């Protein structure tokens, strides 16, 4: 769904998604990872 | 109680953290029972029938507030008082309420922020909310700062007409929600002419103090509801009280008996343990260029440079590395000869493959050795990926101190998660001045729970979390345990040079069972358990001590010549004495070197003067 | 209108200056058209029928006000607003009206101070005025601070009563004299608790700012009558705006776009050029013992000591020398090894003939030679007596700077009045950074009218009063004139070493007609009009010049041997080298120095082994 | 006038005078000199 410009923009195997209302792109981080583009691991609430 | 529960807040701007009911738990686990948000506040992606009643306790956001893409009918922010706008959403705003509608034109309908009375910076934005009621009437020039009012972009579209009219006792018909208490309490555009800031009424005897941010109860400086810049533990000043006051009469400085150190947005009696203390009386994180940090009487200070200041190194997330999120293959050279990373070190899995997004090439594993010269980190160390061929953290074999000034998620200071290393190998680490320690997920990592971390921690309250590493049954089975030649104090690996200690004697860095005073390699002598070799010309024996000191004044015997106290391979032939007098020594049956008669300066082979041959 | 005509105020305390008509004239010449008294206001011995109207201009006394032994029947101080009290009379009071009567019990009768609103510090004493009228009814608890009100001592004994009461439109009495305009206006014990300082009425909408001293005309800090602590050129601040502001968001120190240095009781943009600029941002007279002044890019500053500090030498009238008013033989021993006298210097004619009232012995005129090592004076130098034997200021021949930070009478920073010296002899004086210079009254002293003092002065607006010395033509006609080979700029005496700058060149501390180029005994060269001797190893050139610098590297020809670029007396024979290897050289044909052979240990008289035998 | 203790108190040829009202001692500085005990010359208004 996300164009070829935004590829690999989501780091941890999260699927990129395009928000039509705001005309911006965003991530769909897998559970366990946080951050703008799923970059950090959630150290607080798991290993 | 006296101190209010703080939380760190999100900032993952419009990212969804998993499923609809996995994102909500993350929203709940962060803002539950919180009362002061130290960062941002994202309430994105909350579907309806998700009871968001845990937000009625938040009383102050120190960043921005973003409420986007919800569908819940009511968001109870009924106690938010002030948005300090210390950072902006979309680089302009400090409160954005965007596209909160569902597919079928329904969505957010009640936002009763009836106590919000001040937005210290940034504008507001209210778009694409075709279900919002009663918020189309607020007077946003009582809340937003009068300077930032040219940037507000507020448009309301509620063609449904199913909204509510509100009680006549609201000022100019402006309510936050359907009711009588949701009237907007005005405190700035109704102030008397005399007032400088806020006012609890219209009569001129009501103006609040200059520093009160939202409102006040009384005209004092200890009656503000929320403060503006600082807080002197019962009141709130403009600047923390100076440490040394001036004197208009004597033209000199006087010691202020009520001085305080500024530490963030507070005035403290003394700075924290790991924070630089400037002479201004202020706890900073790293002092300016013209100075260089240095220890002084237990506490850390920083004095002026001796001249041109040495190589100063910045860490990720600060300085020019503001938006870089790992140690790229592009910014790796800027750490060439660093010895103190003023900042923090992130190592993420994107660095070792290279993202085509920011046009960054793949890193070369053997280029990490640049970091071998780092001897301290004034922030935290986040290691999240590492080359597979390696077995220990080889680039950090010289790290010694983690200051823990800035921390990850506000809590952690060391983090080694999900690697393939076999042993940490931080054998020179001796301090973690703040923050916790998490070493977990490393699938095969023994020796991780043999250290006694409480000797590295330099503060009380620091926990540690080691879980799900290699179990301490397969470590013992295979034989992955540290050398028997060490002590029960701890160990960073199997080699003797990997132990925090040595049970008998330490030959420099490693551990040995005995300093050889009787045979073998050139003899040594113990002192504080070390082994230091004898002077090169001391002769070893299968007998008592060969030497008890470094200097040549301690060899029991030397197989070469000797001049009294000290042995020399060949007694000196020109050494400077007193008044240009060179010392002239020669051979002897007693092996001791005597003074010739210098009247034949060509060196004597015998006593007197007939000994120098012709 | 940021200017108010200031004066200095007297400090005689009780002293009558001459006769009853010479005292009044000396009183009139100081408090004329003055608006702010920077010192103490003393009105003593003012006999009957004297026009004291010129006191209707004083608006603020920065010391104490003493009105004693007067007989004039009316002292108009109708515009005095504040008596701040930086110095007490009887070490307790700030205002004092002591015995103030004539012979037949008449005397001071009225004292309309109707604008006197606050005494910042101190108490009040009103004793033995038998003709005073209406001042017995004031409420002094509106003026004096409650902290000092336990020390007051009022004693009203007007046993004549021949004076009318005061208008019923005045608060139950409280009248400063006759009429309805001369009662008292209260501003501290009428208004309610909402006010923290003073006020303008009884409503809580009237409270003046905290930093208003007397009263106010508006609620904000730019409307105070008189400021309480500081003055930011239009407002009554509490501390001058800091030069650097803390940042609660990034834990660092910013810069302040409205920062100002605190100089006295004002906040200026930049310090005066002759003061010490501390790092906090403040003009001071001298900084703490932990530091020492340091010239830096034009301005003065002081950095931390390098280990042990130096001798801080207080001057007369500061620190331990506040009771001493001269350089009396008791304290002369303390200026034993001083270099900078951080203060004043008084030399009075009661130091040489001995004081009895303070049990001090006479000063031996030879004990003044201790000062010949002083080089700076961070104040003024008041010489008022010198031993009649001497003929010049010999003990100050090394003085180089007179900072003039504190000045005599607040005007002068050099006073050599009424000595018996022939010439000044300050031949090393180079700058008088501030304050006038008076050299006058000396019986037989010339050479003072030649120096162009406009060079030494380092500030615009410095005068010079040089009158009634030895006549111009009186000593010109007796050879007592500046020497021949000196620039016409001036001279401090007749000897060639006494002239500032030379006509041609100079040999150190003395002027000469020409450098020793070509001929002479020592060969020399010329740079900046100075004659420096050539390195001894420069062959005396009877033709052209000899050298072009100090070092042997400029020798046109070396006298003996030549070791490369340098001209040496004898080629090196034992100089330390690399790898601890000694160095031996030899002189060849052109007396050039070349290294020996690696094997030659005892040196060599020729190249290689074929040069050094046995 | 003044007791023998207050002798040499006044410096520049001034005369010590005793005030019977305040019960204190004061100087009578000659014309030209100022100060508590006539110690300073008046530089502003003469040479």
Author numbering:
A (entry chain C), D (entry chain D): 5 to 51
B (entry chain A), C (entry chain B): 1 to 614
Please quote the paper that reports this structure:
Domains I, II, and III form a compact unit that we refer to as the ligand-binding ‘head’, and Domain IV forms a rigid and elongated ‘leg’ that connects the ligand-binding head to the single transmembrane helix.
The activation loop is a key allosteric control element at the active site of the kinase domain, and the L834R mutation promotes the formation of the catalytically active asymmetric dimer of the kinase domains, leading to hyper-activation of EGFR. We carried out cryo-EM analysis of full-length EGFR(L834R) bound to EGF, using the same procedures as for wild-type EGFR. The two structures representing the tips-juxtaposed and the tips-separated conformations of the EGFR(L834R):EGF complex were determined at resolution of 3.3 Å and 3.4 Å, respectively. The overall structures of the tips-juxtaposed and tips-separated conformations of the EGFR(L834R):EGF complex are very similar to those seen for the corresponding complex of the wild-type receptor. When the rotational angle between the two heads is at its largest value (~25o), the two legs adopt similar conformations, and the membrane-proximal tips of the two legs are juxtaposed, with a separation of ~5 Å between the Cαatoms of the last residue in the legs (Thr 614) (the ‘juxtaposed’ conformation). For the tips-juxtaposed conformations, the cryo-EM densities are of comparable quality. Cryo-EM densities for the Domain IV legs in the juxtaposed conformation is similarly defined in all three complexes (EGFR(WT):TGF-α, EGFR(WT):EGF, and EGFR(L834R):EGF).
